[PDB]
Amino acid sequence: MLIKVKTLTGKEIEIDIEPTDKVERIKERVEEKEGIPPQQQRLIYSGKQMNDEKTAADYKILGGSVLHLVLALRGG
Amino acid sequence: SIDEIYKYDKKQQQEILAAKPWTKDHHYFKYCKISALALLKMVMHARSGGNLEVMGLMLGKVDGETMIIMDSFALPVEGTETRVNAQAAAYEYMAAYIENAKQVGRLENAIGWYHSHPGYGCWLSGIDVSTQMLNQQFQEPFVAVVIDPTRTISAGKVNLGAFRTYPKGYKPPDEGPSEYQTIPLNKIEDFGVHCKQYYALEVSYFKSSLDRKLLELLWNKYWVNTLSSSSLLTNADYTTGQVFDLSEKLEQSEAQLGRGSFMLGLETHDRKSEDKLAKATRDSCKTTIEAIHGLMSQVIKDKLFNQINIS
Amino acid sequence: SVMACGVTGSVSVALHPLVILNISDHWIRMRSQEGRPVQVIGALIGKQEGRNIEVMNSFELLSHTVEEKIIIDKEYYYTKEEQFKQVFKELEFLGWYTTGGPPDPSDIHVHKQVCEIIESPLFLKLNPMTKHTDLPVSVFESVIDIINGEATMLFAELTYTLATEEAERIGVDHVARMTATGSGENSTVAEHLIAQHSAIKMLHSRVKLILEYVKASEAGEVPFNHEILREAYALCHCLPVLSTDKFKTDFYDQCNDVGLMAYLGTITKTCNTMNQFVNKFNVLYDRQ
Numbered sequence: 001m002l003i004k005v006k007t008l009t010g011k012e013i014e015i016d017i018e019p020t021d022k023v024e025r026i027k028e029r030v031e032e033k034e035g036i037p038p039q040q041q042r043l044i045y046s047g048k049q050m051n052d053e054k055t056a057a058d059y060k061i062l063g064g065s066v067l068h069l070v071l072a073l074r075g076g
Numbered sequence: 077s078i079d080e081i082y083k084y085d086k087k088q089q090q091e092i093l094a095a096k097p098w099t100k101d102h103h104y105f106k107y108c109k110i111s112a113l114a115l116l117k118m119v120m121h122a123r124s125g126g127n128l129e130v131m132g133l134m135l136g137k138v139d140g141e142t143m144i145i146m147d148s149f150a151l152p153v154e155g156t157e158t159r160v161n162a163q164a165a166a167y168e169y170m171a172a173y174i175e176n177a178k179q180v181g182r183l184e185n186a187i188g189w190y191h192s193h194p195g196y197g198c199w200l201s202g203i204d205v206s207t208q209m210l211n212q213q214f215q216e217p218f219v220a221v222v223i224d225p226t227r228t229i230s231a232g233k234v235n236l237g238a239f240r241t242y243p244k245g246y247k248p249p250d251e252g253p254s255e256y257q258t259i260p261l262n263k264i265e266d267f268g269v270h271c272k273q274y275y276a277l278e279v280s281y282f283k284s285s286l287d288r289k290l291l292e293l294l295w296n297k298y299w300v301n302t303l304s305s306s307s308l309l310t311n312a313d314y315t316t317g318q319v320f321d322l323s324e325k326l327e328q329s330e331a332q333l334g335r336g337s338f339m340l341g342l343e344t345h346d347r348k349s350e351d352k353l354a355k356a357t358r359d360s361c362k363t364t365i366e367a368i369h370g371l372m373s374q375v376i377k378d379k380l381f382n383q384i385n386i387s
Numbered sequence: 388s389v390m391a392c393g394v395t396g397s398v399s400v401a402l403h404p405l406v407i408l409n410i411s412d413h414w415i416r417m418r419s420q421e422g423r424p425v426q427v428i429g430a431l432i433g434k435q436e437g438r439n440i441e442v443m444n445s446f447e448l449l450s451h452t453v454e455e456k457i458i459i460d461k462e463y464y465y466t467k468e469e470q471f472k473q474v475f476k477e478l479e480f481l482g483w484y485t486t487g488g489p490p491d492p493s494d495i496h497v498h499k500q501v502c503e504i505i506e507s508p509l510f511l512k513l514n515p516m517t518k519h520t521d522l523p524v525s526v527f528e529s530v531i532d533i534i535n536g537e538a539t540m541l542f543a544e545l546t547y548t549l550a551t552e553e554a555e556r557i558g559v560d561h562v563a564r565m566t567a568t569g570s571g572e573n574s575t576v577a578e579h580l581i582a583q584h585s586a587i588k589m590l591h592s593r594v595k596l597i598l599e600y601v602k603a604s605e606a607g608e609v610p611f612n613h614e615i616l617r618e619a620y621a622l623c624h625c626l627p628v629l630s631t632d633k634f635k636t637d638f639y640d641q642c643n644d645v646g647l648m649a650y651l652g653t654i655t656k657t658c659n660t661m662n663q664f665v666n667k668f669n670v671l672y673d674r675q
Contacts, residue, residue, distance in 0.1 A: 075155070075159060076165040082416060083415055083420070112405045112408055113405060116405060116558050116562075119554055119558050120552075120554065120555055123554045124477075146412070147409075152473045152474050169470060176463070176466065176467055179449055180427070180447045180449050228554070229553050229554060231557075233560075233578045233581060233582075234560070236561075279561075282562075283404065284405065284408030284410075285404045285522070286403060286408075286409075286410075286442075287405030287555075288563070289402070290441070290549050290550050291552055291555050291556035292403075292549075292556065292559055293403075293549035294549055294551055294552070295553070298553060299585070301553070302553070302582050302583075308641050315644075333662070354659060357655055357656050357659040360652040363652070364649055367645050367648045367649065368645060368648075371642065371645045372579065373583070374638075374641070376583055378638075381626065381628050385627045386624060386627075
């Protein structure tokens with residue numbers, strides 16, 4: 001599947017994914033394209049912040065699916 | 077009873093937590109009983125914010141359709157009418173408190189959160205409903221509570237509603253009305269959409285020997301200042317604001333009824349702009365009731381004091 | 388008891404009821420679970436403004452019994468002292484409370500340990516075994532008094548008062564009444580007016596004590612006086628509270644606004660039933 005992801009430059013990038021793949025890998029694909037370290041990235045899939053060690057099939061992401069990238073969030 | 081209520085049962089919560097009835101219905105609850113402690117602590121903490129919002133936590137349990145609020149404690153957290161799930165910052169302080177609490181002998185689990193809306197009424201906002209809706213999944217049981225600490229001094233009646241909201245894409249029933257304490261000019265809209273999403277629960281109490289009485293006796297002297305609320309000037313800004321907005325709604329009503337909702341073999345279903353006059357009449361009542369309530373604070377003085385003259 | 392039984396000290400303390408309901412509730416819980424009634428010892432917080440003390444709030448502390456003595460755990464207290472001070476720093480530490488009947492040595496042992504936190508802590512003692520109708524909390528301070536030439540820590544008792552907090556009082560009303568809604572929802576007029584009602588009823592009771600005093604000083608049973616009569620005389624004379632030409636129009640101006648406001652609302656309500664009547668009629672008697 002090829003998922004689209006909305007970046008912080010105001011554009012959208014399609015990237016290669018397998019459903020079994022852990023979601024921290026997608027962060028690295030996004031680094032490769034957008035030059036943003038996977039260390040500071042947070043993936044939001046439809047309103048919620050995506051996990052790290054959890055997989056993409058755990059989020060039921062399909063090839064039409066769209067991801068939102070935002071920087072780290074802390075409550076205080 | 078009077079003493080059966082005071083003891084907490086760990087097992088009754090373990091059964092309830094397994095059973096998980098709330099997944100079926102979120103309008104399930106209907107009564108509240110809140111401790112004398114819970115209430116006084118909640119008002120004082122709310123009042124310490126000033127006219128600035130504060131959040132605290134409540135410890136309790138549930139038994140059937142009753143919620144029981146045993147104790148409450150304050151949190152030093154900022155994000156009531158901005159940050160969605162402000163409570164997170166508070167978590168470390170809560171984990172401390174529950175641990176400290178268990179060892180002295182208070183074992184009761186967290187029942188919910190309390191916050192306050194000062195000088196605009198007892199209702200949940202956009203921030204508040206959004207934070208509650210996460211809590212009803214994750215935190216359970218979790219209930220929202222609102223109190224106003226300025227409005228209350230004038231009326232003499234505690235406005236405290238404990239509520240719970242419905243999850244997304246859930247059709248509300250016909251459960252509309254509640255207590256009328258005016259909102260400012262831009263906050264009017266926000267109430268209008270959100271109200272049917274939640275319900276308030278009715279409250280009971282109990283009492284014994286250190287906090288209540290300094291207040292009860294003090295009121296015996298104190299009573300003069302509550303009758304010199306004199307609202308009409310203090311919150312003058314409210315009338316002009318609501319009345320200019322109520323005019324915008326009547327323009328909406330003239331068009332809505334005038335042209336009609338475009339429909340082809342379809343008839344309106346529940347909406348927060350469905351039958352505009354029927355909505356609108358109630359908005360006139362929340363503004364009128366407050367205004368005459370202002371007149372009644374004036375009327376009392378005029379008859380009680382001024383008619384005595386010098387005989 | 389064990390008490391000096393001296394002249395009343397240099398501070399006053401003020402006493403008032405919900406917190407002991409918090410203590411009682413715990414006592415009931417603990418008693419059901421363990422199988423024996425268990426006391427709790429705790430801190431007081433409140434304020435002091437001058438030499439007079441308003442005990443505003445309290446919290447329960449942890450304790451243990453080794454021998455016949457009670458030891459309160461310090462580490463516990465210091466952890467709870469840092470969390471509570473963040474939210475309430477206006478309030479400060481007054482002292483402690485305990486549970487039991489008359490004063491005993493095991494209270495004086497624990498009061499010396501509290502002297503380490505603040506050098507002058509208050510002691511408070513509640514009997515829930517009271518056969519008496521008056522308020523069964525009694526307040527003490529500790530005095531260091533010499534008996535047979537040896538200095539002994541002995542308690543001295545304080546009298547009390549009632550004080551502020553309207554914000555808190557309105558909740559004590561609700562707490563006190565424990566009334567249920569009738570056929571409706573309870574009316575807007577009803578809910579609004581209760582304070583106003585009770586306020587009149589306070590003035591009824593205030594007039595009554597002054598009036599019977601003035602008569603008593605004339606009649607006999609209280610002697611004649613100048614200081615109190617000159618003041619009561621003066622109290623009558625002030626009425627009515629304004630009559631000036633300046634007040635009258637501004638008083639009516641606000642009354643007149645709230646007279647239009649009310650008129651424009653009763654029409655809006657009527658418009659609604661008119662729109663509803665006209666809708667239902669056209670469908671039935673005509674074809675719309």
